[PDB]
Amino acid sequence: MNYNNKILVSESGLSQKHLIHGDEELFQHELKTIFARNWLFLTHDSLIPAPGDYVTAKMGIDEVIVSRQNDGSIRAFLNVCRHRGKTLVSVEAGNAKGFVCSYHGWGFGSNGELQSVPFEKDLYGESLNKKCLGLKEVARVESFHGFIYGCFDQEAPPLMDYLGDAAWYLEPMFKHSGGLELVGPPGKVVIKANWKAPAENFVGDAYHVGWTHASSLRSGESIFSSLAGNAALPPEGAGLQMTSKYGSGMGVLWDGYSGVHSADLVPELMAFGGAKQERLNKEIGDVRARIYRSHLNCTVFPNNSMLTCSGVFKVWNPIDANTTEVWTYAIVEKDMPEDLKRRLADSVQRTFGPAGFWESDDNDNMETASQNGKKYQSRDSDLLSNLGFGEDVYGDAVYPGVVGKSAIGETSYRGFYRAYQAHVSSSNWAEFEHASSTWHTELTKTT
Amino acid sequence: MNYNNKILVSESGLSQKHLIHGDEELFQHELKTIFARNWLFLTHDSLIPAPGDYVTAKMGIDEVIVSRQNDGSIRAFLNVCRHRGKTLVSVEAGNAKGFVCSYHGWGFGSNGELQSVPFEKDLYGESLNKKCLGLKEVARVESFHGFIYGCFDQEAPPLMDYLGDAAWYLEPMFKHSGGLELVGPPGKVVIKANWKAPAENFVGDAYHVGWTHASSLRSGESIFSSLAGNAALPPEGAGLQMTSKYGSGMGVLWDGYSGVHSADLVPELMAFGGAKQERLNKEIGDVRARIYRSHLNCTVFPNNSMLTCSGVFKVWNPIDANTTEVWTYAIVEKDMPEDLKRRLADSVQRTFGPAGFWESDDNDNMETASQNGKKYQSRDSDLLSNLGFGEDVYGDAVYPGVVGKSAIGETSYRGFYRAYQAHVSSSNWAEFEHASSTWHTELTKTT
Amino acid sequence: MNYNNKILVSESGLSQKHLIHGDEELFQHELKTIFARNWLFLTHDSLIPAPGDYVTAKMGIDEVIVSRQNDGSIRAFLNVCRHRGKTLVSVEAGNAKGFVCSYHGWGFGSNGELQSVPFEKDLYGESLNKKCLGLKEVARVESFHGFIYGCFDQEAPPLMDYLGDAAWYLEPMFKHSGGLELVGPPGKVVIKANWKAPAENFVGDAYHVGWTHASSLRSGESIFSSLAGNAALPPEGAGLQMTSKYGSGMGVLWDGYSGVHSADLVPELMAFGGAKQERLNKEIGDVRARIYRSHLNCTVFPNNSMLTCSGVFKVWNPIDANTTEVWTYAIVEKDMPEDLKRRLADSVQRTFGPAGFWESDDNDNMETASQNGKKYQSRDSDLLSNLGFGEDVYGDAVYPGVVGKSAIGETSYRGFYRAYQAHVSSSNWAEFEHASSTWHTELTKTT
Amino acid sequence: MINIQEDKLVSAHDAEEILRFFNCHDSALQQEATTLLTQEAHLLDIQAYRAWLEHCVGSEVQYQVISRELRAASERRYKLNEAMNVYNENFQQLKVRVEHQLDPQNWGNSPKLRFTRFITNVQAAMDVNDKELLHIRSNVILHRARRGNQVDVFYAAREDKWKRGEGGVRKLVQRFVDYPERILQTHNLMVFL
Amino acid sequence: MINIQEDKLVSAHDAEEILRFFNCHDSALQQEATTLLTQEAHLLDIQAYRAWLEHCVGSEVQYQVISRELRAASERRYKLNEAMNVYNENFQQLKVRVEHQLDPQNWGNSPKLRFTRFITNVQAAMDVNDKELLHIRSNVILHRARRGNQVDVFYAAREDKWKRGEGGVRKLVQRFVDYPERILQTHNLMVFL
Amino acid sequence: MINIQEDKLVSAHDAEEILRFFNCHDSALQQEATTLLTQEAHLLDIQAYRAWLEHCVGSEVQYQVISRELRAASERRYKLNEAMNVYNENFQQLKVRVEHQLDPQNWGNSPKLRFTRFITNVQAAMDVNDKELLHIRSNVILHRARRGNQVDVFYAAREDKWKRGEGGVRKLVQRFVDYPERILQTHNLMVFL
Numbered sequence A, B, C: 001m002n003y004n005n006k007i008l009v010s011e012s013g014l015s016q017k018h019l020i021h022g023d024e025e026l027f028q029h030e031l032k033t034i035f036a037r038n039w040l041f042l043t044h045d046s047l048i049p050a051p052g053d054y055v056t057a058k059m060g061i062d063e064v065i066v067s068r069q070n071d072g073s074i075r076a077f078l079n080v081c082r083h084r085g086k087t088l089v090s091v092e093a094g095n096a097k098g099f100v101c102s103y104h105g106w107g108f109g110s111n112g113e114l115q116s117v118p119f120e121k122d123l124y125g126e127s128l129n130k131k132c133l134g135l136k137e138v139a140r141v142e143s144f145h146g147f148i149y150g151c152f153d154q155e156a157p158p159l160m161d162y163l164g165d166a167a168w169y170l171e172p173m174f175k176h177s178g179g180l181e182l183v184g185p186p187g188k189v190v191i192k193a194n195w196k197a198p199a200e201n202f203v204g205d206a207y208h209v210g211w212t213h214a215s216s217l218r219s220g221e222s223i224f225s226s227l228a229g230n231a232a233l234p235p236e237g238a239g240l241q242m243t244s245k246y247g248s249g250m251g252v253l254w255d256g257y258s259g260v261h262s263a264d265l266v267p268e269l270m271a272f273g274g275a276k277q278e279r280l281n282k283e284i285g286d287v288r289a290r291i292y293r294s295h296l297n298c299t300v301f302p303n304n305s306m307l308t309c310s311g312v313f314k315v316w317n318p319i320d321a322n323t324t325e326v327w328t329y330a331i332v333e334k335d336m337p338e339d340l341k342r343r344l345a346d347s348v349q350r351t352f353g354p355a356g357f358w359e360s361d362d363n364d365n366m367e368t369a370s371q372n373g374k375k376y377q378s379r380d381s382d383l384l385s386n387l388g389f390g391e392d393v394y395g396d397a398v399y400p401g402v403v404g405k406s407a408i409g410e411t412s413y414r415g416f417y418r419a420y421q422a423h424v425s426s427s428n429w430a431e432f433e434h435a436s437s438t439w440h441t442e443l444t445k446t447t
Numbered sequence D, E, F: 001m002i003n004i005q006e007d008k009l010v011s012a013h014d015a016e017e018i019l020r021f022f023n024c025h026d027s028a029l030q031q032e033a034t035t036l037l038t039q040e041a042h043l044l045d046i047q048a049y050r051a052w053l054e055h056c057v058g059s060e061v062q063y064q065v066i067s068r069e070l071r072a073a074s075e076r077r078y079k080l081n082e083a084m085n086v087y088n089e090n091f092q093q094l095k096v097r098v099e100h101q102l103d104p105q106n107w108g109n110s111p112k113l114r115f116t117r118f119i120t121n122v123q124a125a126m127d128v129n130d131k132e133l134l135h136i137r138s139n140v141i142l143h144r145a146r147r148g149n150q151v152d153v154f155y156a157a158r159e160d161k162w163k164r165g166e167g168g169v170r171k172l173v174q175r176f177v178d179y180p181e182r183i184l185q186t187h188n189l190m191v192f193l
């Protein structure tokens, strides 16, 4: 398939070819143009706070070691020995000053440098240029208020610029609340879906909540329970949707601070969030202070998703076109009392973890939609994402980004997929920029 | 591989390259040129008799919903939601006036039309052209005496014309007997074979019965038991073989009305069939009346097979080059007493179902022959189908089609594969017709 | 990928692209250029000593029947019926005068000839040219002191010439000891590694023994136990490495006759080998007599490996780029007492068999190194094999081949991979020869 | 114990079966059933099919394994045949299958297959009306290996009736299995569950 | 019995648990535990989730399944949260999950799922300090089949505490499972182990 | 009971083994065997390999697992070695394997592996000539999980001999397994069945 010319995503991101969820040649091409080019979530400061602390993470299909250096910075390296290619580290987290390969014993430091080779003098003499044999290093590693992302492409924009207009929405919870911590370890489950299915679902799918999650809403008695079975229209102005240049986007559901949490936690959360909101009003203003205690369902392009307030944090790790490994962490505000942090983390896993009863509702939806993408009569069919098209705005006085002033629509799908076409049809970041010079105009067209 | 020029099947269908049973690129090409172009079995009237009744079926690798409309006709649609591509129906059979998608709640009627969208007025206003969002419909759906077939290609010949010369052989049992019903539900088992292996076996393989099924013949004491272990020559004139233009073909074993059924049913069947034959003599003639109580092993191109009299009805559903999902139904004459219908259905499954002791004999044969097709030294080797070549006739005064006047030969393989080359090397039905303008001459060559 | 131009292995075999262990298109290309062109191990005389005796073996992904003829020679044939392609023989070993296909009953002799067809006269008349329907025969079958190898390519050099300089090293144990027998049946285990990973490991990897096998060395108390955990430098002149034109190569560890065998067998072996060495001194000379009781870790290109003295004999059967089926046999000297033969065979399986505690140490190394070859950021990375480069010699007065006069180095990897590039980039044996006209110069370059 | 109007996922058949074991439990009957089933599984595992018939199977046996069509949880109009019979054998039909297994021309039986059965969750209760009839429930994992690398594993719950017959030996008079996988991924179901 | 300084791979928790069963073994308690667990598994297998709650689960229950992060055998500095809780339910939380299973709009439950449980290796011992508390250990294989060709099999050891409550019925008051597979390959862990 | 001329698929060895359990059954011996095997499996599951050796394994033990070559049902001329020994260990050889498991440089053991064993179909009978020798037969499913997503499951029948030794403790003196899968699809067979 010629990805320079193939229209995989139609103008304004109004539709996508169903094959994008099933085509393995496209998956291989995404490794290059999506995962090797963009920013990917690695970890949080809270998970590697002390020198020598490390975790392993995936970046696309590659595995990396992410390590806290003595000077406080974080560096990440391919988890692959420079000699014969064995996987260096077989655990998920730990503390160490270096890593020794179990094949022939080469020892690398936390800084990636080849530090020792068994019998170097007797075998290699002075012929080994160790300086050239350090672990392959991830070119870019940056932090967004404690959340650490990596990018293999030196030409990528800085992470803050990459977040674009989405950053304004995240900042109340990520910055003005005092800071978040990620509670590990994550749940890890393989699903038979394309990584884009849950990614698109978290970036802008409020439409499915009432129907897909009817049973969980009704059973858990959470704050959104009135939507069960599409029983109830959500109020006018109950929220909005937004998207950005580099693909990140999110839904905003005003005031839903207790999120998906069952009634046992609703009162405490609503009290906690409201008290903070009161102090934030003076620091950042009423609007942003309210964004802080509003439920954001966001995807940070390409494959990192989250539900603020609910505290759900996901990585949709790609394995192949119909296989994804789902990592599930809990996000908590650092100044929450410890007992509440503990209970919120359990609630996140209870709802969205490996046995998350909410997450289970979505399984069939994601798996079959992805697998249908391989079926002959569906490959060339069009997935629709036109809900709200021609009512979105650019450059609003109060809410930045391409924005749909309604809780339920497909604004964020359109922005996610416009960014996806631009990358898949581009060879480098400069070409993506050229393909994206009129992004917001393309997205608001008929308005 | 260039399927315009590659000789996959030699002249007169005398041999086929072994790779046809193992090559995945060819499998993908068959989805287009075999399964998206030809007639495929869906169901029987007896399974969806009342308005709103539906079943799911496969058509190649695609899944479809097959539904009885209020006006009595049957329509079939892709089992894929027009919004984001989720599989609509997750059951095998039921009764309903519509299907609602569990992702976002879109509701489609039994007629395929998009009938309702949750919160349509509030979300889409009047922007949704529902008239353009109906389920993707199977272009052609036709019946052969209750047996319902579908075809995605609007240009296909009518099913009756597609059956060609094979129709004359089927009509005594399918039409003149009063009618058949299919007894569901089917057995369903995955085998590690190419769909063409069992298809070719049922279309014209009487040679294997004595050897492959030696143990079952000897153990069941069925009417064909004398063949066990190739102990006994079948008489001169014990049957014949035939093939047709569009690939369908069958073996005819005179008088074998009790078929593979063990001795416990032989007397009742032989009595039942003989009585009917007596009344049919006056209506359709001695020859056809005898065809009625003669065992036909037939494949309706490409992947539907059956054993009349025995009552076995199979769909060889393609999954990949070395994977097939076998569906097994029982066929019974509608005017048989109910208790006999029940017992015949059990006997069909007993012999040819998921634990069919006859069907088990064939497993290794089909699986290894298919898997050998992937092996390097076998890909370019030639499967032989020359038995009886140069003794077949065209235009006989009594038996129509290209016909081998012997019970055991490879006439039907040759016709099946001549039809297969013509399709795989053709882009549309018109080209198939052009490639098939001298089909019977190609098949009878040296005679 | 263009294998004429792609540099998969750099000059002097100093490095290889990591993708060679994971690329499926390359695997398919190896079937042609490595496995269909070169010599592959089949069996030993000791396993098929009497007329009619046969075994099945793999040759690449193909399966063959290897049978002792009445005249004492051995012939091998594809284990695939000439009619419709069914696998003929389903057992691993036996004695018979022919093989009958269970599909339609065709019977072939031990000599491959089609000898009988059921009902031939009645069905085929005289139309079947049986003389042209014999099993597809392996073009070349030759023996190296009882060890039987096959080659599909009629143009291959004779096996003795193919073994090149490696033959001189093997002859003391294979020829001058009186002869070896292989003790079957083999262990058989599937590992998730590329066939080249264990092949390269056995051909020239002494560096890993101390570290990878630290636990086994320390636990078994074998003669090499001092290396455990790289605790101890091996002496100057403890061995050497060699490689040859056609890729075969080996490590030599002087005097290590008891090999990996735990202390329970060390005294008896060391006594047995020393006594034989004493008589051999007069027949073949001190140097070669010592080679006889020295531990050779050898790979006979491409996928047959062995540890003489230890008595381990392996076939790394290719399945796909990250799947190999490991067959493990024990090799014993024919004049060893029976009880010692029995115990050595158990010890071989104890250490290197399906539950071999040594072999288990290597699993992660091989599997992850191979699987990393599929990972995006590793495909174009370079596996290093430069240890000892520029100290190897050609044409030594005492030790033939390209030789590294040290126990631990990467000489044999370089020769294995130089032979691998030459084949993968060549269309036939003549081109391999042209690409290999300066093999030893390429290998000793900086010396 | 179960009220199927409240325990909405429970079938009437299942609720009836459970009732028959929760009531008076008889420790020795559980032990007799355990022995019967273990010995049956041993005979089957070593492929002593004739012995199994002679020692474990009653002349009036009904040996039945069904595959139920997948229908909507809320289905209430469609009333056609709910399942098909993978097995529905009388003693003579079982004998035919046993003869097929032992025939020297059953090519699929060479080389010899390997079976391993794991029987668990045994429950036993006497019938309330026929005092000679013992109800036994058990679950089975059956592992079948052949031809080097073919491995199939079967999983099922068995509802049995066993009765003393010839010589006082308790024999199988009914076995019912509702096979849990709708589409078999084991090549076939040619095993005695 | 175990000295964890010599049996270097054994955790302190595991060594403690074993001690509680090697001492005085009580054959009848083993038999009572076998019955309890078999009946529990039967109720669960037929999806009588309300009955399971009413008859097998104590009001003070802690139902916990953890997933432990993979760490170095020799790790001794890194001290952050060692595992996550797949389940950590009180009775009310279990009821919510049961209501979710029985809701008619739980689309994933149509067509009906099929469960088969295999319980083995039962051990039972009374607690030394609470004479009303019974420690039961058992292993479970749980087979789940749905939608034609989806089959997931779960494997786990269960450390339970059971206590007599309402009406003298022994009920589950604690279940602890340390789930052996770190990355689940079963779509989810939405089953009651 | 079995006549191997009529039950043509049954081996002489298998027919001999069955005879030794169908005769006088001893309910308490079955129960003692169940306890022995459950405790053995617990020790192994928690990787208390030294304890297993000390408490479950006799000094004169023969621990043997074979892989039999696939040969024709009708083979009668070819007479060469029928199988190979995956395990054929004396006590010292088992100790070596245990030391290998516990060595801190066994890199394959970090992170820690997870084992779960399921023992079923227990039968027990005293030997007719050695009154101190107990014959125990059992089937085992062994689940091994490591490194996130590696899962291997083993299936086998075990023919054991156990005898009272040091301190009156019944210990394993012979274990024989004829492993049912010819080509292992589990990376290795590095587990104690």
Ligand SMILES: O[C@@H]1c2ccccc2C=C[C@@H]1O
Pocket: A201, A202, A205, A206, A209, A213, A224, A251, A253, A260, A295, A297, A358, A362
């Ligand atoms: O189910 C979720 C959710 C819960 C609550 C609000 C929005 C969302 C959007 C995407 C998630 O799937």
Ligand SMILES: O[C@@H]1c2ccccc2C=C[C@@H]1O
Pocket: B201, B202, B205, B206, B209, B213, B224, B251, B253, B260, B295, B297, B358, B362
């Ligand atoms: O085994 C079958 C059969 C039985 C009886 C007559 C013909 C046939 C031909 C094809 C089927 O495989």
Ligand SMILES: O[C@@H]1c2ccccc2C=C[C@@H]1O
Pocket: C201, C202, C205, C206, C209, C213, C224, C251, C253, C260, C295, C297, C358, C362
């Ligand atoms: O582990 C082995 C070994 C043992 C002993 C000596 C050399 C070797 C080299 C390769 C084998 O893997």
Ligand code: FES
Pocket: A081, A082, A083, A084, A085, A086, A101, A102, A103, A104, A105, A106
């Ligand atoms: S592969 Fe890592 S030291 Fe050799």
Ligand code: FES
Pocket: B081, B082, B083, B084, B085, B086, B101, B102, B103, B104, B105, B106
């Ligand atoms: S995918 Fe069907 S309603 Fe959205």
Ligand code: FES
Pocket: C081, C082, C083, C084, C085, C086, C101, C102, C103, C104, C105, C106
């Ligand atoms: S495939 Fe072998 S005789 Fe027909």
Ligand SMILES: [Fe+3]
Pocket: A201, A208, A209, A212, A213, A358, A361, A362
């Ligand atoms: Fe959702």
Ligand SMILES: [Fe+3]
Pocket: B201, B208, B209, B212, B213, B358, B361, B362
């Ligand atoms: Fe057949």
Ligand SMILES: [Fe+3]
Pocket: C201, C208, C209, C212, C213, C358, C361, C362
């Ligand atoms: Fe090694």
